[PDB]
């Protein structure tokens, strides 16, 4: 199912993610707007892949990072997230702090890359 994991818990929904990112081509051309859907879908996919790659996450959907989790973002227990809450509710509740997390991930990835380059080279 394309959205078979929707409605389940976050832990249950964190499985078989590959079916969520296997969109293919469709339709026959009638005018320029038909091709605009294809090119904008390609641009969105490339944007998502580039955003995921600049954080040090390439080729893997699940990617654990080293940025600490601030308690002020959600301030809810672990049993309130992965046991009963759904992904849509969690996204609606956490969308207010996406930019800070993205900036922290970018800074952490750059810092880790620079530290790796410094430590590997000086030996």
């Amino acid at each position: 199912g394309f959205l078979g994991a929707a409605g389940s818990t976050m832990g249950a929904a964190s499985m078989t993610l590959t079916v969520q990112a296997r969109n293919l081509l469709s339709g026959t051309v009638w005018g320029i707007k038909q091709l605009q859907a294809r090119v904008l879908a390609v641009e969105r996919y490339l944007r998502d892949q580039q955003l995921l790659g600049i954080w040090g996450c390439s080729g893997k959907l699940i990617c654990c990072t080293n940025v600490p989790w601030n308690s002020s973002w959600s301030n809810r227990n672990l049993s309130e997230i992965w046991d009963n809450m759904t992904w849509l509710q969690w996204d609606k509740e956490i969308s207010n702090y996406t930019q800070i997390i993205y900036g922290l991930l970018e800074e952490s990835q750059n810092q880790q890359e620079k530290n790796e380059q410094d430590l590997l080279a000086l030996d």
């Binding site: 959205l3 994991a5 993610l17 969520q20 959907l61 940025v67 600490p68 989790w69 849509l88 997390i101």
Partner: peptide
Amino acid sequence: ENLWVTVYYGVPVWK
């Protein structure tokens, strides 16, 4: 317990 941020791709969330 200490928690860390993790990014998930292919998530069924729609708007």
